[PDB]
């Protein structure tokens, strides 16, 4: 705190309580006895618990009839108008369109859809596979997740 | 009939005005202007002008007949004091309080 170190008054004889610096945390405008610093909240998982817990949430998505397997599933023109009718037709309000080969055709056609996130099969993460209402997968994407999760 | 009239920030303090208000509280106006006139205090001179304003707003914003016009309600409640520094002996400092007050006279016919 931008201040001094000179004691504000005498130690003895003044009627006021002892005080030694104006920067003390009991005073106004000078303070924070345990001030926090920038830190790293990033905590470590074992590798097998991450891969295993992805296997467990794939299990939960399967037994609830939420995880959807299709074959090769992409859009034709880079237009979100196509994905509106297309995900109207399958009755897919909020999805995780996760494929194994990403392109400029499909990913651009979902960059402005809210409830749609189209990932690469390398990049699935355990908050998305729960945080979407359905998940739809390429057979190639299942082919890769079978390998990676192992 | 309500017809209030008040004087905010009366620069004589409330304990000294409130002595004068304890004379006219509950009388007719015709008694009140004279009893305030012959009272030898300053806040009589400060509250006779408030009650005189209450007369005029009663005759001029609503019904007249000053003859039947009681002072039903009058209350002085204190206002924001004003903080001034007083130098004293041996280097210490005091804080004198130029206190102000709010006079309110509510004159009515019934």
């Amino acid at each position: 705190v931008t201040g001094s170190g000179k004691k504000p008054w005498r130690q003895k004889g003044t009627g006021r309580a002892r005080s030694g610096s104006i920067k003390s945390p009991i005073w106004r405008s000078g303070g924070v006895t345990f001030a926090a610093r920038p830190q790293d909240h990033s905590q470590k998982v074992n590798k097998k618990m991450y891969r295993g817990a992805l296997k467990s949430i794939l299990s939960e998505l399967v037994r609830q009839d939420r995880l959807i397997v299709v074959e090769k599933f992409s859009v034709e023109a880079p237009k979100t108008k196509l994905l509106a009718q297309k995900l109207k037709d399958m009755a897919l309000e909020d999805v995780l369109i996760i494929t194994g080969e990403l392109d400029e055709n499909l990913f651009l056609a979902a960059r402005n859809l809210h409830k749609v996130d189209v990932r690469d099969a390398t990049g699935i993460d355990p908050v998305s596979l729960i945080a979407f209402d359905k998940v739809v997968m390429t057979a190639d994407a299942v082919k890769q997740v079978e390998e990676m999760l192992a | 009939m309500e017809t209030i009239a008040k004087h905010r920030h009366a620069r004589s303090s409330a304990q000294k005005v409130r002595l004068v208000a304890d004379l006219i509280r509950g009388k007719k106006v015709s008694q009140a202007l004279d009893i305030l006139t012959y009272t030898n205090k300053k806040a009589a001179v400060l509250v006779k002008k408030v009650l005189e304003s209450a007369i005029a707003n009663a005759e001029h914003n609503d019904g007249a007949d000053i003859d039947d016009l009681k002072v039903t309600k009058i209350f002085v409640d204190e206002g924001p004091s004003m903080k001034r520094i007083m130098p004293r002996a041996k280097g210490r400092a005091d804080r004198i309080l130029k206190r102000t007050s709010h006079i309110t006279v509510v004159v009515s016919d019934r």
Partner: peptide, 14 residues
Amino acid sequence: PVYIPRPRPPHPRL
């Protein structure tokens, strides 16, 4: 107050 004076000395007792 900026200046607080030294207190009036005690009755001896020594």
